Amino acid sequence: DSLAPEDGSHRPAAEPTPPGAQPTAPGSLKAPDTRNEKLNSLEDVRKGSENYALTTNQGVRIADDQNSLRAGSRGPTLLEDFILREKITHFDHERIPERIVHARGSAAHGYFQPYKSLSDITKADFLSDPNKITPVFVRFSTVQGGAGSADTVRDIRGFATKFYTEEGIFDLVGNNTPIFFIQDAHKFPDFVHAVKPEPHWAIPQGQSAHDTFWDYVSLQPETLHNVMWAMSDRGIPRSYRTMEGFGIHTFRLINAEGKATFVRFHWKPLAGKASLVWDEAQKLTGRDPDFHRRELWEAIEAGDFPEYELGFQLIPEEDEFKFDFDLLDPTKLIPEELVPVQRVGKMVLNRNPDNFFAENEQAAFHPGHIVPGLDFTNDPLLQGRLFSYTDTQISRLGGPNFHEIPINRPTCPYHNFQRDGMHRMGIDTNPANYEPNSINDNWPRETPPGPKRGGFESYQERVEGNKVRERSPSFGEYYSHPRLFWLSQTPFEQRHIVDGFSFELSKVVRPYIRERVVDQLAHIDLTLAQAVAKNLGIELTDDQLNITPPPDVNGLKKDPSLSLYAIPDGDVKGRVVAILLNDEVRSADLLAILKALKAKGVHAKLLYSRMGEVTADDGTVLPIAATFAGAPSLTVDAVIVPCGNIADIADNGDANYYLMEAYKHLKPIALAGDARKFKATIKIADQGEEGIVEADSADGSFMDELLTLMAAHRVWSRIPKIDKIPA
């Protein structure tokens, strides 16, 4: 009709803007100048809308899209209304099966580039030159929950990267923990059925806190290592930008000379490692179930591109048997103290999709999608994964032509003798649909392996043994890796692990399952088992107290790279601060606050007891982003309260609770001038306490002190003090 506002405020500016400043929008409209080879190749299918007539799918203009065709304006709808039927038909068949696992995920486009050529250890074209840019499409996910489930659950996270290389698609399909729960792919359905919602009633969603999961874990000790990781704060990342990524399996790099090197893939978050705390994470699934999806999208819209460093743990073929654990066992990590991660390149995620369904929901990643220069190993979990990811998209994406769905298409050439199949897009002109043929002079043709642009040939690994359904005896060790993880965590991390297990086991209705898990914990570490047992009202038996702890892992009694926080790696850029306003804010405090934050790339959200505007002491009109209840402290990293008319919000329950919640969840709090009246709400001594910034004004070192606290992420020293606190 011409419904947009005449001031053009319905449309977000096509420039980087901080979270909440503008309505979010499709990537190609928000950042039209951000391009890459894959984004450019999608232009043949992108469809605009502005200034076009509304039509049917057959191109017929529609005159009246408000009404069905009927006999009389109060009459029956007629079967001849083809416009109505096409429209309802398309609607009626919008949904496709969600992914069996990792159904909940958020994605973005980006690019990768190696730091140096890796030609000495791999012939993979995408790693051959520092000036070779490879477009990527990354999808981060949870594991258990459906596509409509919440983001901040306690779960493993998926981290899948599609590399659109010149020699084929390479999908690095990893998780955020360096091991998996099980050893052989044959048990995948068992483990997944145990963690997913129980079959009689389909409860619970997005949670391993239920009987069948802990029943399985209790009977399958190989799971304990990844369970330790999920029970730690690793299971509740602050954002996809602040978690590590791992390929888990040992793969092979193959160079031009034919040498095979064992490799484990790593992704290091350039924003650092950071996680929530359980109470915050759980409440946040309620206050904002889309928190991670939203945060990823807004980071990219703000120019805070998620950046990751690809790294390789490399192990020579001659060292295959030199560790206490098997290199092919996916339940075992390779300690970085033994084999360092060598930095390989950087990945930058800089553009959101246009249409979530078309690009994210239909994206298909599969770890079998490798390119010359890479190869597999006999890891029995990886081996079975290779079967699943091609199979599953026959139903998920309707057939074998899923590589023709725009997001999945290679940007490099693809030609073969495969034909037909549902939804076939490619119209083949080859006279032949078979090889060998003479009628097209045998094109397209096979290509011999070679240093560059050659055909794929598997590494000639020696195979020797009988046909058996047998677990290698080298895989039968289940407690040393769990113990190594435990011992590498800080004391507050251990506490959170103890709390994770305790909370989850408390949701297990059958008490014997809790007892059985406690017995397993006693094989890992007595302190851990005792603390969990104590929280479950369970007493360890004398036998349990005397279980000998598992051996160190190759002499290591800890590896600090396993902790999120043991070694500081703080990065404040992209974090956000809640600013609690009053109706006569000291504008000077606000100016100092906002400019300090902006200088470090830290965002702010101005909150009040209503929407609209408030006027500062000097007449400055302050736009309100949200109310105290509307954007809870769960969604920010720190809270600042400027001086002004504090009596306005002093007796506001929501404003007081805002600080209590943020205080309980160990976030930095800064009070200027009369805002110090709120110290009594969080019980802060006159003298002050580490973790609370306070001064007569927001000047001098007030902002630097708060930013130092944000750099450390959370105020771990406050844990004992939050123990009480009714919040």
Add this chain to the structure above:
Amino acid sequence: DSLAPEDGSHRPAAEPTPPGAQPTAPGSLKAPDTRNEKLNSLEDVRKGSENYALTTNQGVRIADDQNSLRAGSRGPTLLEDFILREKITHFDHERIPERIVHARGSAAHGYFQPYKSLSDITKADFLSDPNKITPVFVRFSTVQGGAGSADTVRDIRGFATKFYTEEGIFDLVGNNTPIFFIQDAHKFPDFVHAVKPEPHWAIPQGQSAHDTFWDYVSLQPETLHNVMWAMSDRGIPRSYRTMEGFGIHTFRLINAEGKATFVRFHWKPLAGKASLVWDEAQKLTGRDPDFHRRELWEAIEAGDFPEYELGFQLIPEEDEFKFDFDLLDPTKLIPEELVPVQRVGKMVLNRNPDNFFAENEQAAFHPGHIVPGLDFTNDPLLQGRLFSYTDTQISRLGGPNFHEIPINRPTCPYHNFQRDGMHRMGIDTNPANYEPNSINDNWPRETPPGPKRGGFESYQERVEGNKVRERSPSFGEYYSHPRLFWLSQTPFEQRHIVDGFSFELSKVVRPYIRERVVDQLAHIDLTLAQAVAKNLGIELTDDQLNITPPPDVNGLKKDPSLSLYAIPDGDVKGRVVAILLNDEVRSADLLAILKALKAKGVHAKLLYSRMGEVTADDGTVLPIAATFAGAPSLTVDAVIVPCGNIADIADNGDANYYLMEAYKHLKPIALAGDARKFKATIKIADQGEEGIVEADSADGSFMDELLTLMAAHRVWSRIPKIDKIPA
């Protein structure tokens, strides 16, 4: 190996048990004696498990379900492992498309029976005899969220009932509010796309609180009536057992004489009407996203069978045009003050399904599934619905044989000349697959319409008009029903409506959309418009302040049946109380508490600071249901704190917070003996306060008081005292 506990505690007793007393289980194992014709008919496909060998789907016994077949124990997985491939293949294809709308839902089996024969107004067989029982299967749902989204969101709820009658399946596919948002089915995709997650980033899940929903609403005033209902506490029901159900459209009843009577269908909850409050509902989506699903399942396991009374609003054909609204407009309700709801029969849900996927997920309901004695009308929304529910299951349920999926099968005879289609189960022996035929003597044959067991014949409604895509002028009135609804709500219901709109519109990023919605509210009621505007920091113009309110609906200035709470309808059976234990509970208090609760069918959950057990003062061992943090006050209807060693929990942060949350959410709280010292936490009253029960001990009087409070659901008089509380 891995086997059941010696003591048999892995398996739930097969008898009615209170929530939490036993692990939940498949219905046929929990209540094997609960039968009905439909449940029995599902016995052909029910599959046991105990004492049977594990096999492939082809019936081959599996020796080792722990490993893939490989060449050597550390070798490559072989392609000949068909056991692994079948198992992984079935896993890979588990998911089916979720429903386009109402994907989130919970179901149960039950039975219905009319109070008396309705043969004078309808020939429908299921309403013909008070002693003839009809098996039902009911699915309750939300609308917007995916199948993995949360239960206690703010949304409309679906209430679909499949009646397995002797003359065909009758599906009564309704919602929990008496009107829908839109008038013509052609706009269904528009409305649903606006409320669903926005297309660029697929946010937000299970929420209408986003720009596109309010944009659509602001441009389509026909939506305002159902929006009023959604924003009231109707949008966040306490349970599926405590909400009304409505068919929305005017349908027809056809008797044996051929007389048509207009009818609107109602379901009255025999447990009464009850809703949560927003803060509670929203937090509960995070603490227990499966709350309604769980609550329904547990109610049925406990014997608190959800019971509903079917009721009809009947309007003679000659009264079609006598209201000031069109009877065929689904955005208009029929005030009970004008046309009373006649009681028709009772529906009882007494058995949970066995497998959620097979029975709930694959259930197909469709409002076109009617039987002789019922008929449609020209309601333009209902008309388009008839097209869509058959159409959508061709993708959702994989084909046209969805009536052969066990839960969907009619229990009466079904014979026709339709053949084939994907996964055809029925093997037809008829020599003929067409009619007329002589080769099978024309069987199965058509049946003339008649008083009973007759063929379906449409009511011969007179149709007169030109072929038009036009809305009836009579549907062009959008503010009087919204205003009637507003004026019928109690003062606290009005405030919660105000808060609903305010909260939602505060999440609309484009400010002009908020203003346009406020403008629409000014057309309904200025008090309402002004209260919302104040919260958004918006000022009504002088023009807006002078908008004439819409006319009363046929002289009505209010209709108390539109309110949840104006007319007392409380029922405590099935409700649940949290009991905060201490390590030396005064058993005399507990005895009295449990006895009084038990006499009214109210359940209890014993909570503590840890799991396991605590021993009362008389040696009674009390098993702990959950921790204070583990089963928040959100999940209960009231909180009781018995005396004993109060020092044990007096300083516990979670225990204190438990009471503050319950207090803020207007729930009855009862404190006996030294537990009255908790009154300081909820900072209020010394002489007592209506809503807080206190006494030296828990006695008959104390429990009567608490139970009387529970019968009124929430303590609305405490509203003014809760916005200072920091919780």
